[PDB]
RNA sequence: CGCGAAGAACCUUACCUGGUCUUGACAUCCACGGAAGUUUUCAGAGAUGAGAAUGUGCCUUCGGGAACCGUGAGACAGGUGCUGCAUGGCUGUCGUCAGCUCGUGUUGUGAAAUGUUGGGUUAAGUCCCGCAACGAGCGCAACCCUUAUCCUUUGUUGCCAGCGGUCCGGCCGGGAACUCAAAGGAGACUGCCAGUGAUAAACUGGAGGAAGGUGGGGAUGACGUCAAGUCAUCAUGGCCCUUACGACCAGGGCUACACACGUGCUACAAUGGCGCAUACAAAGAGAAGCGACCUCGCGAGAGCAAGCGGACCUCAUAAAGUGCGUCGUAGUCCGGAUUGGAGUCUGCAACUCGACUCCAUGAAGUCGGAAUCGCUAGUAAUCGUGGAUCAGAAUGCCACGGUG
């Protein structure tokens, strides 16, 4: 069977939204198309910087991007230098005057997006896929993830037929709404087409 | 029907017809305007209207006035 | 003069923090506050086909709730107009102000 | 859709803002109005000579991302497919799954 | 149903008479959830009845009904090819239901003008027992006695 | 004195005031006979005044919004019987047994994606 | 098989005909020239080709650079081209079925087994008791939304019980009770009583309660199954085309019709048709928008023009119902297909091919062979209302209440 998206069923229960601005119907489609391009930019720039999550709010006129990332140093560059040359190409893309922030991520082993990006990276430099999965599971479980499954898919070690090996460890309860199930996803672009990588990460409940 | 504030014709047909009334009748006009109401001033002429490939000769009678040009080129073959 | 503040916002906990600021801010700077009366709540609905090609009965029905609050102020001081103008709330609240 | 077909829906917006939005909104009133002039329209014949893609009728909506003609939704400017992809990440605010 | 042994719903009694058994008759006669116009037809064709068979309006029904009420029916039942019509002694409640239902399928079949005519004449002829609703009860009591063997 | 009840059924919401003294039934400033032009709907607003006594004993002024006829009826029925238990109290025993105290929970089932109505599936074809 | 398509006149468009372009309709890079833009002009079906005017936003260690346009040659672009049997992503399906597994132990040369079976019980591998098993995980259940009772707070644009006044209108003083609105809480757990039962789990009944044994409805779809579906949403490995399979335009086509099937709507009529009066909803939408009042028109509509980003205004008179009249079992005052005439509106444009109105015309059809579908209660049946898509184009789709 097909599963509901575990982020999406849990919005306004235990997960919060990422675009958190109000509009009326004139300017709604435009805000969406701005917020798309401000994310489609900041993903392409900060690929090395290890970015979990780009929140956007819109107070007043102005746009306010928070970034969450494993590596604050490489975004802030030196004296900002890089923060401040992000702002003035963001503030074109919005139209309004901008404001970038940063947060850490303390445990990059427990973010779904970063675990997936990680695994997806290793698969493009031709690492054996069972090692790449199984490192990632161990790493989360020694830093106290209550559980974690990962699930790669489709031409693994350059086979001619697609398969999906997956590998749980601990508890991962996806029909429990109360459960914080950090989830995310990534495509590895290899010489054998794409390989897709899901990652769930239970962290406990309420 | 086009409500009674207008009837309709293309300029490139209107002016090409004013010529071959005024100058004198001739080899037929090649229009693609199928959407154009036959006026009184067009009578007698042969117009050759586009069916989708061939232009098809239409001798404009008195009785045709009011009908559209496209009504006398059929588009689809059938048996 | 009557000034009245229609607050509206997609989150119901975010809006009645922003209300409870404004009811505090007016009372402290010398005014009689009315409300904050709850108006009804536009819930939109979008059904969408869910597969990329065919399967017409596979669907996903979303909603947006828009919560709406009203706060009338009957006695303005000269402070009370500027106390609320200078205030700044969360991003997901939309204020208005009629006169 | 194609790159050509996305380029065509910039071309058709470019015109209809420049022309009809001012200049044909004159002539659609001169072709209307019964209580002023019934002979020197001239304007019906002049409305043809405007470029054909100045009409807003001629504009399709595409999904501002994938360019897909069908499945559009005006509130979001998006295909049903991309609405749902974006909904579930939390990129459309206030939007959740409903039940009643 | 297999597990699900169940109660049943209290119908309101009939507002004119207070007759719970007659409310079931307007329900049976009702079409498309128009209980209104069922009641019009029924209350009418009891006036036309009770007038023309010496009075009592509850009890001109319950004489005509008592006549069509069955007492046995068949209940077809396969043994291994040929199929055995078994007579079975019918319940108290289902007696009325079958009676009421047959009256109305008889009334709905005739060629008088209104329905309140048609009904009145297949409650006349029930009480003086001819017409199609008792020709139904007789051709059910054949089948029970013709297959009395099998019980 | 004014003894009050609310009552509801389907989308109807009746509000029902009970005065002492006499026979009379008002309902959106109309007579009971004017408002309900169906006999079935009349002898369910009166129902609770039968198990409990009235000929000429309490007036009632009532108003009702929403639903249709037999909805509004049932709301009023329930509205009365809340108001009776305000006034007397120890009539609950008899009212409970006819079961007019039970707020009737039945709404319309919503319509469901895939189906023509609440439960009406479309016509299946094997082949 | 009313499926992609939540809406093919042009557009859409991917197809055909003819007419055009070749670093290109779309993007980056370098070179050189011009501020961008504005404004009519004659050819041509149109794409396209030949003409008047105009500033100079900006800084200039003053070269021009940046905004933007054309020209130039190649790196390239482009492809709704092929493969869903190379893929990701997304979906259908068995099936909301109660199952599917693991670790450590044990039995067996071994595949494997045990657990997971047995005795009860449950909607449930649900729970108890047993037993070489002891435990764990994904599922079931719960946690979420909605509906059913009450309480607290808060009263305008919603409300009007008790007060005064009235143009009889909550309309105007006022009221904060009530409905309603939307936040916060309470409530239902086999909790209490009796009996049945291995003192177990549970079951059957009872009380009080708005609701009683998962109270009703949704969301929630285990491991997997069918090389199921989709390269034409998107992404993508490979193959392929590159003065054409790419690109622009006008006209046509996707609406064809000896036929066969699917899914619907309307019927065949007195539980009815037509005419006149008259009552009771809910849920929605609205600024290149909804559009009142009044005036014109038989009508579709038109003219004028308040209000309303909306519990305020508009769409918007719910219809079945009810009362009074009328038709009399007739292919009819049932039925509305078809065709002729005349209009209205949207739109550059209704010929191919839109919807709606008026006058006329008045087919088939008298309840449907073999067969076959849906439904267990506010359900089926029947009655209207709204929405998305949308210039216009709903008998479809999604939603709402009525009767029942």
UniProtKB/Swiss-Prot annotation, chain A:
GO biological process: cytoplasmic translation; ribosomal small subunit assembly
Gene3D superfamilies reported in the protein's UniProt record: 3.30.300.20, Ribosomal protein S3, C-terminal domain
A Pfam family: KH_2
Keywords: Ribonucleoprotein, Ribosomal protein, RNA-binding, rRNA-binding
Molecular-function GO term, any one: mRNA binding
Domain KH type-2, first and last residues per copy: 38-106
GO cellular component: cytoplasm; cytosol; cytosolic small ribosomal subunit
InterPro entries linked: KH_dom, KH_dom-like_a/b, KH_dom_type_2, KH_sf_prok-type, Ribosomal_S3_C_sf, Ribosomal_uS3_bac-typ, Ribosomal_uS3_C, Ribosomal_uS3_CS
Family, as annotated: Belongs to the universal ribosomal protein uS3 family.
Known function: Binds the lower part of the 30S subunit head. Binds mRNA in the 70S ribosome, positioning it for translation. Plays a role in mRNA unwinding by the ribosome, possibly by forming part of a processivity clamp.
Quaternary structure and interacting proteins, as annotated: Part of the 30S ribosomal subunit. Forms a tight complex with proteins uS10 and uS14. With proteins uS4 and uS5 encircles the mRNA as it enters the ribosome, which may play a role in mRNA helicase processivity. Some nascent polypeptide chains are able to cross-link to this protein in situ. In collided ribosomes contacts ribosome rescue factor SmrB.
Listed name of the protein: Small ribosomal subunit protein uS3
Organism: Escherichia coli (strain K12)
Gene: rpsC
Curated annotation (Swiss-Prot), chain B:
Gene Ontology terms: biological process: cytoplasmic translation; ribosomal small subunit assembly
Cellular component per GO, a single term: cytoplasm
InterPro entries (UniProt xref): Ribosomal_uS19, Ribosomal_uS19_bac-type, Ribosomal_uS19_CS, Ribosomal_uS19_SF
Gene3D superfamilies: 30s Ribosomal Protein S19, Chain A
GO molecular function: rRNA binding; structural constituent of ribosome; tRNA binding
Keywords: Ribonucleoprotein, Ribosomal protein, RNA-binding, rRNA-binding, tRNA-binding
SUPFAM superfamilies per the UniProt record, alphabetical: Ribosomal protein S19 (SSF54570)
Family of the protein in this entry: Belongs to the universal ribosomal protein uS19 family.
Assembly with partners or alone: Part of the 30S ribosomal subunit. Binds S13 and L5 and cross-links to the A site tRNA.
Entry-linked PANTHER family: RIBOSOMAL PROTEIN S19P FAMILY MEMBER, SMALL RIBOSOMAL SUBUNIT PROTEIN US19M
Purpose of the protein: In the E.coli 70S ribosome in the initiation state it has been modeled to contact the 23S rRNA of the 50S subunit forming part of bridge B1a; this bridge is broken in the model with bound EF-G. The 23S rRNA contact site in bridge B1a is modeled to differ in different ribosomal states, contacting alternately S13 or S19. In the 3.5 angstroms resolved ribosome structures the contacts between L5, S13 and S19 bridge B1b are different, confirming the dynamic nature of this interaction. Bridge B1a is not visible in the crystallized ribosomes due to 23S rRNA disorder. Protein S19 forms a complex with S13 that binds strongly to the 16S ribosomal RNA. Contacts the A site tRNA.
Gene that encodes the chain: rpsS
From Swiss-Prot, chain D:
GO-annotated cellular components: cytoplasm; cytosolic small ribosomal subunit; small ribosomal subunit
InterPro entries in alphabetical order: Ribosomal_uS14, Ribosomal_uS14_bac/plastid, Ribosomal_uS14_CS
Gene Ontology biological-process annotations: cytoplasmic translation; ribosomal small subunit assembly; translation
Keyword Ribonucleoprotein: yes
GO molecular function: rRNA binding; structural constituent of ribosome; tRNA binding
Superkingdom to which the source organism belongs: Bacteria
SUPFAM superfamilies named among the record's database cross-references: Glucocorticoid receptor-like (DNA-binding domain) (SSF57716)
Keywords: Ribonucleoprotein, Ribosomal protein
Pfam families linked to this entry: Ribosomal_S14 (PF00253)
Function: Binds 16S rRNA, required for the assembly of 30S particles and may also be responsible for determining the conformation of the 16S rRNA at the A site.
NCBIfam families documented for this protein: PRK08881.1
Known partners and oligomeric status: Part of the 30S ribosomal subunit. Contacts proteins S3 and S10.
HAMAP family the UniProt entry points to: Ribosomal_uS14_1
Sequence similarity: Belongs to the universal ribosomal protein uS14 family.
Protein name: Small ribosomal subunit protein uS14
Source species: Escherichia coli (strain K12)
Gene: rpsN
UniProtKB/Swiss-Prot annotation, chain F:
Any single GO BP term: cytoplasmic translation
Coiled coil ranges: none
Subunit structure: Part of the 30S ribosomal subunit. Contacts 16S rRNA. Cross-links to the P site tRNA and weakly to the A site tRNA.
Function text: The C-terminal tail plays a role in the affinity of the 30S P site for different tRNAs. Mutations that decrease this affinity are suppressed in the 70S ribosome.
HAMAP family: Ribosomal_uS9_B
UniProt record similarity statement: Belongs to the universal ribosomal protein uS9 family.
Protein name: Small ribosomal subunit protein uS9
Taxonomy of the source species: Bacteria, Pseudomonadati, Pseudomonadota, Gammaproteobacteria, Enterobacterales
